[PDB]
Amino acid sequence: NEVVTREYTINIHKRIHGVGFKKRAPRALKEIRKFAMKEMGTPDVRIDTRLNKAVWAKGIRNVPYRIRVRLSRKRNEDEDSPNKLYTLVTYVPVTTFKNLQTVNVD
Amino acid sequence: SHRKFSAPRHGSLGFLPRKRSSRHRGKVKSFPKDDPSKPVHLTAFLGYKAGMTHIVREVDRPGSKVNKKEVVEAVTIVETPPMVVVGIVGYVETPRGLRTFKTVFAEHISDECKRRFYKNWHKSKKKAFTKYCKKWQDEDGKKQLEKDFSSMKKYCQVIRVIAHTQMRLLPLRQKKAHLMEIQVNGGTVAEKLDWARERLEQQVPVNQVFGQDEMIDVIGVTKGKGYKGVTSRWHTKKLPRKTHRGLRKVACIGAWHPARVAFSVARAGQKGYHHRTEINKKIYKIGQGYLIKDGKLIKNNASTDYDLSDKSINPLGGFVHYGEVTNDFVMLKGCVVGTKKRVLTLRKSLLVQTKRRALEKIDLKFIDTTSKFGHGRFQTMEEKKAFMGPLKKDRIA
RNA sequence: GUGGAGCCGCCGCAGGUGCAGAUCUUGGUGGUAGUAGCAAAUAUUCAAACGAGAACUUUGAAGGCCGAAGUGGAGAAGGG
RNA sequence: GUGAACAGCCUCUGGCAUGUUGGAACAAUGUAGGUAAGGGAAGUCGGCAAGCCGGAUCCGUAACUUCGGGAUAAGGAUUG
RNA sequence: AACGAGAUUCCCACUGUCCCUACCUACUAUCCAGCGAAACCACAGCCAAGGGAACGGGCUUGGCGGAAUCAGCGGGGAAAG
RNA sequence: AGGCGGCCGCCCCCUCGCCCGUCACGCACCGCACGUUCGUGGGGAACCUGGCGCUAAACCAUUCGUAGACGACCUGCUUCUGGGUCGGGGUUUCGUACGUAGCAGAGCAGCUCCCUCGCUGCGAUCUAUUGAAAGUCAGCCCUCGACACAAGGGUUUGUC
Ligand SMILES: [Mg+2]
Ligand SMILES: [Mg+2]
């Protein structure tokens, strides 16, 4: 039940592969969800709108090969589910992915 | 009636239940039948194929046009770390066949045998053979464990050896040893049993079992191709283009009056992943892999008398989908049953032969270790950056 | 045992007088079977809101199609 | 916009949610679209089907003829 | 002569029509959530021979004969219409 | 298909463990069937019950991709040679990135030091940086650099 926040590179080129042209960027957002419900640990994965714009910025079938995201574990409120934590995955733009590894922002 | 044009059967009816085999490890259906006049030895050995390369050799063959010339040959290589003997089995001959008399396992058993005795090593309490190892040490169990050898010596007449592989020395993921059960073909059954009491829980290398330019069998499970149709599983001819409801089908599958489809007809199902035995594969080289650290790591594989270059048989870029061979190997002329990383059991041939292709001495001249992960054109990393020169790789000093 | 207002024996009388069939007539129910199927015209995604409840509603954002002989704007017959 | 063009293809105004469902997988057989070494009708009742050729500019065009044609004959060269 | 979505024969060019097949793509088939029919049906459903309305699934004599099922398949049901 | 058998040493014990003869009684149930054995057979279920012993493993979920239509199959999941994600290398594919620099550039325009390489601008390309850039396991190879993560579940299974 932490409040931690890390940032990550997701190469989508490994993670959607052999997918047909019209199911290619829509899977690229449920593989970000499957990444984020694996690592922060909670099923309620939220992603913001400016990351939906980030993956879809080149049509469906040409997803950018790698994106830089950050995952924020936060807790919920107001007559909540038996899941009481949610993850906000928001989009951080960057210019180079070389020698960028999983750091822990505080 | 009477096809007007003769043509033979498609496919063989001797492999007819084209079925997924019930085993991943190839089963020796028949070890070589012995006489006790020979010295004592093993007959079979487990190995893992890594991939293929090719070779160049000065082939000696009088009469042929191949004589005294260089001729390339496809070769597979099989990574074989030494086995480790665990058990002794005894088989008594009956009028119903062989029957296991009893087994004796080793005094203390490795990690990777014990992992083969479970379906979930994680959830297990790791408890197999824990009460069996305590009859080697108590006074009462020890005198009736060596009584089970003296009763083995009296009655049963063919004895075998349970040995497993050392998966720790291998680049795979598996870490379960493959537990084989292989027949000793020595002299009398007292010397045949004392040769295995001497050497429980000890290593048996691959050069002790096989020899160079000697011809063996290969037993394994084939590449699995899945559920495939009539024209691919059975190589049946396609129908013409104009055919309604389909091209890749066999058209007639029987006459009227046998009112019943036959086993001899071709129809769709599982293709591949079948248990097969290739016969008469010649060993080209017994490898020795990555020895002592006095000279820090002598690679020295694939370095023939005509090469004299510090090479190693693992190709430039590594074996594709396999890893990197750090152990002993046996390389075999030609194609071999199985995917890469698949357990295949090498075995001395039953039949004797002369044939002038067996018993010939092969002397290598060249093994390429070029990149199989593309159209590679260099053979060592020293050779490339001599030709390629400096790059933008270092670019700091 | 259910049921809740009619019913039967004998002597005579009189028939629209007794079903297994007619690819019978009408009504009902199976098995096939949770099966065939819900595949013509490129495509959906994120967040939010109202709600017991959202792949489909709405709203914003992105990505697409029609592409002015239109999937646009109005009519005639027809509908009501 | 391209172009000879109310062709085709792409966009703006204006419309729409992919045409009575969604998810996962990517076996056979199919339906629809490609590609194939060497040979080039040997396939077949039959060159069926598919593929070649294709626009425009500069030349150059036979037999035959009802003198009109054939004729974009055929056969080349070029193209940013 | 000209013109034929007319019939035919040859030649050039071209090509998976063929030698001789192989691989890739979409939509399915396939599995799941929901929804869900119809033709058909004496009883049913493993064979060999015999006899028989002369070509049995049942009958005679033999062979033999384990639940429950899935994706296919086109021999049979002298399959359905 | 030994599951059965032989021998011996000590021991609570018998001295009738047989045949012939003597003496005399026990349900003699009053004519009657399923009597008499194997046998404290086999199987199941629980109770009162002394002693000696034992403290698991399957399947699902998750993972893998040597496997697969679906099931099935091959594997991983230790609190550190555990394997997962990023990063780095290796391998390889295509063919030299953007930007900057140029006395490279068919020429053309302007200005004036009217200027026989005067200067500047426009300009496909070309040269240098640049065997560069970009991709690379998703079913490539080696990593043990950095981040975490792991015992967290679910369903059942016993031999009078
Ligand atoms: Mg045998
Ligand atoms: Mg063949």
Coordinates of C-alpha atoms (C1' of nucleotides) in Angstrom, one line a residue, chain E residues 2 14 19 23-24 26-28 32 37-38 43 45 68-69 72 76 78-79:
Chain E
rA2 C1' -15.5 -3.2 -92.0
rC14 C1' 3.7 -13.7 -71.5
rC19 C1' 6.9 -30.1 -63.7
rC23 C1' 5.4 -19.1 -48.1
rC24 C1' 3.0 -14.5 -46.6
rA26 C1' -7.1 -10.3 -44.6
rC27 C1' -11.9 -12.6 -43.4
rU28 C1' -13.4 -17.1 -41.0
rC32 C1' -14.6 -18.0 -24.7
rA37 C1' -32.3 -22.2 -35.1
rA38 C1' -33.4 -26.0 -39.4
rC43 C1' -35.6 -49.0 -34.0
rG45 C1' -25.8 -47.6 -35.8
rA68 C1' -17.8 -39.6 -21.9
rU69 C1' -16.2 -36.9 -25.7
rG72 C1' -11.6 -32.8 -39.1
rG76 C1' -21.1 -46.3 -45.9
rA78 C1' -28.4 -48.7 -51.9
rA79 C1' -27.7 -40.5 -46.8

